[model samples]
Target: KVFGRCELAAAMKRHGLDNYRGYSLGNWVCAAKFESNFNTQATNRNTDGSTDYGILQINSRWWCNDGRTPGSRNLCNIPCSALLSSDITASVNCAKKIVSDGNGMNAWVAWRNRCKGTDVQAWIRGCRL
Candidate 1:
């Protein structure tokens, strides 16, 4: 995993996650931190029976197909397991699609509640990038 926010920011930059659809590194990293604490193996199930996958906690309802999961839009055209992989390029691509759908980072509940309207510059404070 990344050593800290700096490494994460660098990775995000390398993968072009920063400035994608005008999303700030602060918002993106903050979302990642809150959603999964940078753990690629993270997964959580919603009450609606859909599950969130990976660091971004992308929902099964629309983004991915989790096999037995019902009513998935599978918009990302990828399996949920792909998000669990350590390499986040697929996850980044999927997140780009999610934001492109006009939700931006608002697609993440954690972003709306924790990062929005808050000074999250600290999320990238020590990052050299």
Candidate 2:
């Protein structure tokens, strides 16, 4: 599903992404906007033969198992295909695990380049969170 900005904001909040660590809801919303454009089915193959999956673009190299990424740790203990689900529960859970691992949101290059040090609140400006 392709979510509107506000809809994505609300969903992410409901999934416990709001201030999950030190990051705000707007930071997550901003990362999603740049990572996948709010599309649940988004996937990007990396130059290293790994793939990024789902809204936050979780990677196959260390997070999810895709059966194709060599030496995958599958630290999220989920199939990469699970990330593509519109439900987003698995995706969110894995994302939380990523953040909890001390990587913070910088695990995603998009977040580092676009959301970090920016006024991410603008991403959810009109959203009634």
Candidate 3:
């Protein structure tokens, strides 16, 4: 599912993304906007032979197991395909794991470049969450 701004914000909040690990919900929303445009099934192949999957673009090199990436650690212990599901439950959980592993939101370059240290409140301005 492709989500609108407010819709994505509401969903992320419900999934425990609001203020997760000191990162505001707006930051997550902003990252999603630039990473995948709220498209659940988004995927990007990296030059290193790993692929980024899902809305947050979790990487197969160290996160998800795509069975294609060499020496994948699968730290999230989930199949990369799971991240593409529209439910986003797996995606969100894996994202939390990434942050918990000390990567913070910086694991996503889109977040670092576009949402970091910025006022992202407007990303979820109209969201009731």
Q: Give Cα-based local distance difference scores for all models.
A: 0.86, 0.92, 0.91
- Name the 10 consecutive residues with the lowest summed lDDT in model 2: 99-108
**Number of clashes in every candidate structure?**
0, 0, 0
Indicate the worst ten consecutive residues by lDDT in candidate 3.
Answer: 120-129
RMSD of each: 1.4, 0.9, 0.9
lDDT of candidate 2 over 12-114, digit per residue (tens): 9999989998899999999999999999999999999999999999999999999999877899899999999888789889999999887788888999998
Which candidate would rank higher by lDDT, 1 or 2?
Answer: 2
For candidate 1, write residues 1-129 as lDDT tens digits. Answer: 433667777777889988889988888899899988988889999998999998899999999999757866799999999999878888888998998997678999998999988887778897788
Cα lDDT tens digits, model 3, 1-115, are: 8988998898899999889998899999999999999999999999999999999999999999998998778988899999999898999999999988877888899999998
Q: How accurate is candidate 3 locally (lDDT)?
A: 0.91
- The lDDT, on a scale of 0 to 1, for candidate 1 is 0.86
Question: Once superposed on the true structure, which residue ranges of model 2 sit more than 4 Å away at CA?
Answer: none
Could you tell me every candidate's TM-score relative to the true structure?
0.93, 0.96, 0.96
Model 2: colliding residue pairs? none
Better of 1 and 3 by lDDT: 3
- Residue 44, model 2: lDDT of 95
